[PDB]
Amino acid sequence: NHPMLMNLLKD
Amino acid sequence: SHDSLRPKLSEEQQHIIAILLDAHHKTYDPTYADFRDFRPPVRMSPLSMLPHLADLVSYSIQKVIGFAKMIPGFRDLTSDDQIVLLKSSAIEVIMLRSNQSFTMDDMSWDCGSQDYKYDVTDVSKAGHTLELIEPLIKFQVGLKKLNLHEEEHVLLMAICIVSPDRPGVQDAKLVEAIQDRLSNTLQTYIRCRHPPPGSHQLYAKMIQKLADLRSLNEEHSKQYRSLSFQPENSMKLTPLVLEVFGN
Ligand SMILES: CCCC(CCC)(c1ccc(OC[C@@H](O)CO)cc1)c1ccc(OC[C@H](O)C(C)(C)C)cc1
């Protein structure tokens, strides 16, 4: 449950 | 013993440094132009700086994540480990990166206009007490006095992030493998590029600053938990701060 962190990590 | 006792920087170590300098330069704005987009500072209502500083911290978390993604190997860890590492380190990296704007004159953060010149009273007006403020200022002064090269500063932030001993890390050995490559690069950099004196005992002093950051993290976390327990305070935070620091 860390969608914003996960988004900022994605490429 | 070989990569660590290496006399001069290898080509690989040189690339690591170049990558981290680029990563820092694309995630640290020394003009602080985005600060005008935050909720305005309110000074002189005791938590009056909480909204502005919540925005500043939220912005800073985004930049720390941006930096972390460029550390060689970091993106090759599992997503869960990346998350754990960033949740645990974010406040420490913020403390490290802020040192670039910190001035020993009046022990303030110059960012770089009067409204965005932050002092101990601003931290106080975010809800923090002297139990945090005092060791935080000590740390900023201690770090500033080390007079790090930018190379050492970016290596220290990366080493901070990729710490295998954080609670919740799954693949500790893989994390350690990255941290070791970075620590060796730092050791070799200091030996061959940092002139005596000031290279004297520099590596051990930097490692000590990492331990000091752990203590500062614990104190900040305790105070944050106290503040954010009251939902009217949590309401004033940002979605990313809540996600990364908890609610
Ligand atoms: C007066 C603020 C000084 C400081 C010191 C951190 C060492 C700061 C942070 C980021 C900066 O960013 C810019 C910098 O990197 C440019 O070099 C500058 C300064 C800070 C900010 C917020 C603080 O608390 C926030 C609460 O915990 C909250 C709201 C989460 C509930 C505590 C300290």
Side-chain angles (χ1 to χ4, degrees), chain A, chain B residues 1-10 12-35 37-247:
Chain A
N1 39 343
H2 295 87
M4 305 169 182
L5 185 42
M6 196 73 270
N7 184 60
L8 287 168
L9 284 167
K10 90 180 205 299
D11 193 41
Chain B
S1 218
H2 192 70
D3 256 334
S4 57
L5 283 170
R6 201 175 281 271
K8 215 272 168 293
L9 288 162
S10 65
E12 284 205 348
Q13 291 172 330
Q14 291 173 63
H15 294 290
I16 291 163
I17 295 167
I19 286 166
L20 289 182
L21 287 172
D22 170 81
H24 182 57
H25 297 155
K26 66 227 282 203
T27 54
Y28 187 96
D29 177 9
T31 72
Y32 313 102
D34 296 321
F35 285 36
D37 308 327
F38 306 159
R39 285 174 285 176
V42 174
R43 310 169 159 98
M44 308 123 192
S45 188
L47 288 189
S48 68
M49 283 299 284
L50 206 185
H52 180 76
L53 289 184
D55 289 344
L56 175 59
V57 165
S58 196
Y59 178 78
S60 295
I61 291 161
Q62 299 183 44
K63 300 305 162 186
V64 173
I65 294 160
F67 177 78
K69 296 204 320 193
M70 310 305 166
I71 299 174
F74 179 85
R75 294 193 94 197
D76 299 327
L77 297 172
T78 65
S79 70
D80 282 344
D81 272 345
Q82 293 178 223
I83 289 166
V84 165
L85 294 175
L86 281 161
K87 289 182 86 284
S88 57
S89 67
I91 196 58
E92 298 177 21
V93 186
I94 292 170
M95 292 179 184
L96 286 171
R97 77 205 310 277
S98 73
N99 195 249
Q100 190 176 155
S101 69
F102 185 76
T103 171
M104 271 164 59
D105 287 295
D106 53 359
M107 293 159 270
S108 78
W109 295 268
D110 187 16
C111 293
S113 69
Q114 198 52 229
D115 312 56
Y116 314 116
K117 191 152 185 292
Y118 305 107
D119 71 336
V120 293
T121 70
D122 292 316
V123 179
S124 182
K125 288 183 194 158
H128 287 298
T129 68
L130 281 304
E131 307 267 356
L132 178 60
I133 291 159
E134 186 184 75
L136 177 57
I137 295 289
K138 214 225 153 174
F139 174 86
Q140 297 290 320
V141 174
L143 187 54
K144 204 78 189 198
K145 288 206 273 188
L146 294 182
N147 242 108
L148 298 186
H149 293 194
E150 195 165 38
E151 291 87 340
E152 294 153 350
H153 177 64
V154 302
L155 281 161
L156 189 58
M157 293 192 290
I159 291 164
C160 180
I161 295 160
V162 192
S163 290
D165 58 329
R166 308 291 195 174
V169 169
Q170 238 91 102
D171 292 320
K173 293 270 95 181
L174 298 192
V175 178
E176 179 184 62
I178 299 164
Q179 198 190 47
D180 283 348
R181 198 156 141 86
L182 301 166
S183 291
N184 293 341
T185 297
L186 177 59
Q187 279 189 69
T188 302
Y189 181 89
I190 294 166
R191 279 195 311 264
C192 82
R193 294 274 186 96
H194 198 122
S199 56
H200 185 68
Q201 292 221 109
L202 188 55
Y203 182 64
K205 286 175 188 160
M206 297 182 67
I207 301 302
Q208 180 54 234
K209 289 292 183 273
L210 292 177
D212 290 349
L213 282 164
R214 302 302 186 108
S215 177
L216 288 162
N217 190 336
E218 263 282 316
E219 189 60 32
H220 177 272
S221 299
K222 186 188 173 66
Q223 296 190 204
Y224 178 84
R225 284 195 302 279
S226 178
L227 293 167
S228 68
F229 188 63
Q230 297 267 260
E232 80 172 0
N233 292 341
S234 285
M235 272 200 315
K236 290 170 182 176
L237 274 16
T238 71
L240 185 65
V241 168
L242 286 176
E243 202 190 84
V244 170
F245 289 169
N247 21 345

